[PDB]
Amino acid sequence: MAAVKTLNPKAEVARAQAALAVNISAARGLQDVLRTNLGPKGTMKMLVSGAGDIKLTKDGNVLLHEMQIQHPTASLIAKVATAQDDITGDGTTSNVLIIGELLKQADLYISEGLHPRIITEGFEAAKEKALQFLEEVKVSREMDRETLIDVARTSLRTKVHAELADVLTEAVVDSILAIKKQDEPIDLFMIEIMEMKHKSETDTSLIRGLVLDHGARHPDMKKRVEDAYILTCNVSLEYEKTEVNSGFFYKSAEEREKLVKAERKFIEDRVKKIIELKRKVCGDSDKGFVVINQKGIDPFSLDALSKEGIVALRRAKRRNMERLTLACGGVALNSFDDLSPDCLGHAGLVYEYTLGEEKFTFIEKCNNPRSVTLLIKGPNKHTLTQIKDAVRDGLRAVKNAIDDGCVVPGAGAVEVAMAEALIKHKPSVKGRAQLGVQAFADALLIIPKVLAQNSGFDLQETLVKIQAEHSESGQLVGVDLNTGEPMVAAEVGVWDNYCVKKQLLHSCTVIATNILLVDEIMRAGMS
Amino acid sequence: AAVKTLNPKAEVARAQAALAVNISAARGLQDVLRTNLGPKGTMKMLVSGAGDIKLTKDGNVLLHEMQIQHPTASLIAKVATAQDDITGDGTTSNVLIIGELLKQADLYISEGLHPRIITEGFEAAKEKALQFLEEVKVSREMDRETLIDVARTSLRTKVHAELADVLTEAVVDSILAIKKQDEPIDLFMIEIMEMKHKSETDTSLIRGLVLDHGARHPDMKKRVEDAYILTCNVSLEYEKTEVNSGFFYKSAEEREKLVKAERKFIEDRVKKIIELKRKVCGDSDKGFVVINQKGIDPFSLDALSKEGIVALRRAKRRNMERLTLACGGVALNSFDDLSPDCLGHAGLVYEYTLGEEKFTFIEKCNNPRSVTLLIKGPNKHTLTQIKDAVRDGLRAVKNAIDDGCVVPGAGAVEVAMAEALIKHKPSVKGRAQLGVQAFADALLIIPKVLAQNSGFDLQETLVKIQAEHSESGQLVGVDLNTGEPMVAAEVGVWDNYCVKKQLLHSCTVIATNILLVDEIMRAGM
Amino acid sequence: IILAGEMLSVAEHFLEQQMHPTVVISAYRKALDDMISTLKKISIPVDI
Amino acid sequence: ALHVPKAPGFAQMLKEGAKHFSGLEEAVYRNIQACKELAQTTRTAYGPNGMNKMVINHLEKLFVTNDAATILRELEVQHPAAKMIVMASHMQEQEVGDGTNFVLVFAGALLELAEELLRIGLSVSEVIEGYEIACRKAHEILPNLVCCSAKNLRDIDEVSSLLRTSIMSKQYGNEVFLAKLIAQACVSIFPDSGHFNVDNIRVCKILGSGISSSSVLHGMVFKKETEGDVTSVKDAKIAVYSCPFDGMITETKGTVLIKTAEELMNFSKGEENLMDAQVKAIADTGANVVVTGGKVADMALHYANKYNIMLVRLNSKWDLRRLCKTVGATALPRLTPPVLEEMGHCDSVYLSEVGDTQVVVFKHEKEDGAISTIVLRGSTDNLMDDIERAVDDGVNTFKVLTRDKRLVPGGGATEIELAKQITSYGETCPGLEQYAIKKFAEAFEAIPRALAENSGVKANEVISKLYAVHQEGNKNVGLDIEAEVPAVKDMLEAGILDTYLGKYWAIKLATNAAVTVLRVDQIIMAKPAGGPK
């Protein structure tokens, strides 16, 4: 039929209007599935893997990854949403909805014989105007604890149950405020997220310290030390084989015993260095050492340390070196050549918790920790995964708010105002690109539509109420999900990240423009 | 689903899936048949499994000759089949309007609106639209010029321009010939005979009949100037007794006597015919033609040819009535009482040979109430296309005659109807105004498709036409050569009022029924 | 069809509570008799 | 016109084997039906009159029991909602140890009544909010339903009476004897320190003599034999070594380099003399029993036999650690003689045969020790396994009593009181949540209903009598098992009591599981493919 099929008989090709139809159908399907995620009133989806793992989720990116889809346009939209999640950490469902509505509105005119190029030109003009309006409408504000609490609520309520969201808000805001250095970028690696599987979902909390998923391997070591010095080291305390193939040669049993006793001198020197430091630092039984080691410790060294009342942990995570040096305040050591009491961290309490066949070590009551941990607790694995995803979204939202002092009213108010501004600006656009501008505005209007639809109210009537209120008052009125009436999102506290909105606009416009200009799909790499 | 539990091998589309499936099928049919509308449409080649070739742009033929296995496609095909069967035109517009109605309805349904409101708006809009169509129709005296204009408006859309110009005269003359004042028109009296030996422009109207069979006995005359026509339905071949007669003899002489005497029954009727012929024409100037619906055995043919009588056997059943109306005699089922007054008259009868087939022409009748159109073309597909075109033209002219009204075409009526519907929309309570707007936009598809097929752009052409209609109030359509608004009545682009009314009714009914379907289910196995 | 489905649905509740189906059947027959009586009682006449 | 095509959009993009269920009928009702089916499968094993089920897993192994958690574990449950309910039951087992069947039954009843509420017109959100409110009310009410406290855990009789109810559901006929055994075993453990360790109770299953012959041993039993000739010590001085009982060797690579004839002739003799010196040094400390976690060399065994030292070789390090705990020794890493602190002591170590299995017994004469063991006898492996499950339930009950001493009346009395009080509260509450609250209250009836059905009486009469009696004001009245006619009796005086903490956790977990199931609206199942594990 086509040229490709002539050259390659086993090739699949869609040309001209077929390509547009295929892409728009895929976008519409994705949008139809993800409609129900948007908003705190959205429905929870249940995902079962091939192995049978159960995952309860509401996140757009998580749902997209676990889709059973093999469509090209779906793959493109999934990649765009993945980038959105990677950078800003929120707005994936909004991304998909806006892309789908942009494509639908563009098709509404393209099916009338209009060329896609004009629609794309209108799209870019409307995007420029919309970015200007978003710059106009953002609310620059120094963010104390209250504003961060509001933002964290606006995210977590959409992700999880209301009470769980209420707990997680305090958890995430306190953690971010704890690890936040003045006028410095926030390092989210410094907030460890640990999962325990015994208590209820609301028992998750924040520990002003660190939690390690392993404990001491010697039964004789202390299970709880009140006042503790912390030694963070990256030195192997187990037996090490010589790099150059030593081998031992002896002529008698006594010589063999001498060689056996003398083959551990190297490690025993470092162990005795640690022992000497401990005895110099604390001559009483009041205090104690906790030795967190990134590398292993053989049982001989464990016994030697336990004989001196020292608790030691082996095979710690690499990030835990920085985490402990930032929380306890010591110095991570790659060798014991010159170790002094000044390189020792401090912790006001260290104890071990046993849960089934897993040991957990708590390092808390630090002086002023710059790295904390978020202990996730729940009765199910899927509950833990859902809480972990929600906490990631909340952490990203709070960090985004801290990064730029501005914050954008939510509940669809900003999209309504942007659509009205675009409609007002439409006559200024010369040519037939006014059609593209109108399509862009109507596509932006999808967020209040989906919010009202998910809340159960009528779609068009609620939207016209919101638009009439905004036009007559000029305020930033959103969708009240409880009554459907216009509501001032700024006063209630429904806030959205400005960076998230900007990324939404840019990425959605770019991907919609690129898709609309595609006029052929080829699969001819075979044979 | 619930159904799949009882019948595991069941296919079900439920809720929005049913709407999506139906609307997708309707849009596919619309996308295929957009290119057919208007004289500027595109020829389509239709190759069957056996390799037969059909060239057409007729909506119904194309619908029946696509390879579709969709339920919604089947429903739309049935609607178009009914439209073609009763009115003979508007099938392509039927499919286009149905598809656009469903598309415009879905445009609002996808916003959360319930289809019932859309259907209520459709009902109100249909009532108002029918009122406007009654207000806008043009009552005229159907003279030759108006009928020619209607026939042109159909044929130009169905075939090439010059062929359409010839077929206009053919169709109009035939309809005027067979039509008796104040009497329903019988299209069975217009025979459509096709021959395959000359160019397509040689199709003409014969003021008589053309028979696909000729004289069998070679000695009968090939051409008779003045003839008496004997239309009969009497068997002239040997007939067997119904009660198992059988013959019994005892010598060769007795066998010969029985052989000679067994032909006496048929010979009596042959002798009756011959005696009537001798009584009617005692000279050799006049002629005698016998057209028999039943067979004639070679003995009877020889006996008739001995008297200089042309005899044709196994004629078509409709040809009895056609010859009675044209020549003016009477069809006879028996020769018990036959008189010179039972004979029709024809001013010329001759036989034409074309390859292995022979044809008989019966022309120069006094006042033929039944005529024939001789389709001529070099190809089978050309003949089929001309046959479809002349069928559409005959239906159009008959419809125009039946009711003295005719509607301006070229999309003008749809534009005016849409404008009137939009003006009437505020008078509709509730949210049915959305359905009314959808109906108006659906009606506006005809000028849009005409603009595309002419090569122009939809939006600019449509806004120009709508602005002209609003400013002047005239019925302005689409000028397929310039794209400017143009008064359809003045140029002669006419549409059948019955066709428009049928379009509105059928399209609205089928769209309402499809929009209200919420489950497609196949569990009969 | 809807009524029969609903009656069976509500009878399942009793079948799951150690009630023999014959008792349910007797109760249903009494109910049907009283339904007939009430329907005849609340009826109104019509002149054709 | 003979095929219905797939709807455009997501339906067409779905994978080849994937499934997608959406809406009420397709997803929520199906999940509720699956959970109800699972509850029905496990229902008949509830209470003292519960019936054992013989479950054969995919590995052709036979399980016979009425422990709900074990049955659910051995069943290959595939429906994901039932999987979620099973996870809830397993969480209840891990947190408390008893009440898995209660969790399953309550969740099933709650989901059934939720389906009823959804059918009559309520929304999922309203049902969920009503269940949450009712669960909060039940958790508030429950502390007021406590009838008595343990008030002593060092008494054999009191502990046995407390533990009888827990191990009466399993092994109904003979529970007093098992209660006494577990009470003695638990009282041996649980020192003056309030901490109680479940792993300190070991169970040894020796087949043959009927379960009535089981006993409690203050020490440990290992189903193995002694390496050496000495087979009995009356004043044991165990010295435990985690290293193999052999001359220690290098760690990189050891080769015996011989350069003269004299070294070759003297090497083996010197090695033997060194081993002899080490063993004699060990023996000179008074040690007469040696326990090694590794292999035993031939020369070491010979020299130990020369010095009259008992050898025991423990294969698993867990057993070595447990023996060190129960004896008081420190697992030395070398062959050095043990100092007086590291030397373990025991009243008697000897080899004995029980049935046809040879065992090594570390027996303490004192009524104390870190670790105590129960020797289970019986005529079948499956019977001993079931008795071990009952013992585990009793030990977990003792642990819970150590954590919280409050007890509530059993035999459905607590459930009836909770149902009555929640029904009373829900009537005063206006709005659409009253239906959900009343259904939550009614879901408590499934416990006395299951008990009455399993006991062979009419459940409705029992429930009506329970409501009547609780209406006069007796909140400690439950159904009487030992009656052929529906009857009720006081449970506080009958001693049929279950732990308050178990009830609290079970109610919380069942409510959470039911609500979590109700929250689901769409299911997107991938192709099952394989996944053997």
Ligand SMILES: Nc1ncnc2c1ncn2[C@@H]1O[C@H](COP(=O)(O)OP(=O)(O)O)[C@@H](O)[C@H]1O
């Ligand atoms: N309490 C609330 N009331 C009204 N609108 C809200 C409320 N909380 C969030 N929203 C709006 O709902 C949207 C939630 O989107 P969300 O489901 O998080 O999509 P994504 O995960 O892609 O960001 C936000 O745009 C916000 O404006």
Ligand SMILES: Nc1ncnc2c1ncn2[C@@H]1O[C@H](COP(=O)(O)OP(=O)(O)O)[C@@H](O)[C@H]1O
């Ligand atoms: N010469 C013309 N100029 C402009 N419009 C025309 C002309 N001839 C026909 N039309 C319009 O084009 C349409 C032709 O439709 P047609 O192809 O006949 O569909 P159908 O065969 O289904 O009736 C008519 O509606 C008529 O109004």
Ligand SMILES: Nc1ncnc2c1ncn2[C@@H]1O[C@H](COP(=O)(O)OP(=O)(O)O)[C@@H](O)[C@H]1O
């Ligand atoms: N002697 C008894 N009389 C009446 N009820 C009893 C008796 N013993 C136990 N029960 C009841 O049996 C229930 C325990 O059932 P069980 O089979 O242990 O399920 P689970 O293991 O999930 O708790 C308790 O609610 C208790 O009230």
Ligand SMILES: [Mg+2]
């Ligand atoms: Mg979000």
Ligand SMILES: [Mg+2]
């Ligand atoms: Mg036509």
Ligand SMILES: [Mg+2]
């Ligand atoms: Mg139990």
